[PDB]
Amino acid sequence: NENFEDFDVEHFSDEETYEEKPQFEQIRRKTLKEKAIPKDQRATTPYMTKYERARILGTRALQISMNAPVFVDLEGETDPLRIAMKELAEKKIPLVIRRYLPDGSFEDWSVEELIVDL
Amino acid sequence: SDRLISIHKQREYPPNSKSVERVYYYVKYPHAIDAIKWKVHQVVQRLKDDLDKNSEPNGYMCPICLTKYTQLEAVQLLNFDRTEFLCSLCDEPLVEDDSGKKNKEKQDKLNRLMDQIQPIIDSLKKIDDSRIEENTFEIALARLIPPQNQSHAAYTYNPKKGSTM
């Protein structure tokens, strides 16, 4: 065992305190085609989010590492993450983002039309 | 547990005041006969069930693992040589069971049950043709022949007020 005078705080140990103080629709239904919001009336942002960019880069890098065809020309770059970054830079990632609204409806925004402003 | 007799938990007050919660044993005729009908009826029912289960074909069983395998899933376990059923675990040729060779024996046992219980069914026919009085302890006290002289059990009933069970 161990016996040390150096008080290392027991992290994730709140149950001592817990035991100390214990007393005190209309437009869309089911999964129909109406769940697909059409392109003309999409109300989400036209900008790619940081999470959308992160998951597109991760998915594309995983595909490139698992030997997907690459739709840009390579400048001697070997790492799938920077190959995916170049594919994002000149818009050669053939994926779409299904942005789910809280009611279950979704909007399809392709990576080509999404603006990477970050 | 077969309700041929039922119990009464009455305690009395003897003159020596050494009272105990004694128990009385008597017979409830309609509940008893209904229990007899239900028991013999459902006994006939699952004897029919047992002979029916014998009447589907026998299937097979593996002597090494002591597990049964009917004909429906033995054909998932037949070999590549298309001759023997091999066990899924033991990989042993399946041996023949005897569910169907004993169907005539089960029919004979059913017949021997029935001709033995013919007086029971005749009595049930008579008591269902005629009308029976639903007796209880209080009714059964009326035709008592007493069993012993120095009996600590007093057969007088004591009614109570407030019991709404």
Binding site: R55, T59, L62, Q63, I64, M66, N67, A68, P69, P94, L95, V96, R98, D108 | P57, N58, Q71, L72, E73, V75, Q76, L78, R82, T83, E84, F85, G100
Partner: protein, 171 residues
Amino acid sequence: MFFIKDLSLNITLHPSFFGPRMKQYLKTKLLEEVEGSCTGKFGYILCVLDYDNIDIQRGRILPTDGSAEFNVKYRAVVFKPFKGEVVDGTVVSCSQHGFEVQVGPMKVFVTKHLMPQDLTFNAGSNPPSYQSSEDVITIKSRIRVKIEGCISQVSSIHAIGSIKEDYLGAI
């Protein structure tokens, strides 16, 4: 029996086939994963109908595997047996437990308890066969059999036959 049914399958495409002919790769994997494939829910699926127009919608990328999942809807001819159904077939194997009859893509094994009692095994014949007073049942023999039992797993279907009913047996 042979049927035609609308079928749907979730098929997984590896990222290496994310090319301009991804739809062609999808259709080819539909072929060599559905044609001749056995499922217990929809029977033995034999051939895919309407290959020119196969319904392929947008395919979801799996978040960890990285592969694309397409829910392909198609038309196909299937073969599903049922309990109590009379089908014809040819014997392909014989034994002392019984004999298998070949109907469609499926082997139905008829046990030795489900022939008339005059019909008996003869293993001295080459090939071994079943011989009775009026007919002989051997390999490559036309025979009509009733299916009175069917078990269906996820990927396998096995049936039980009987010819003890009158006007069954060899044709």
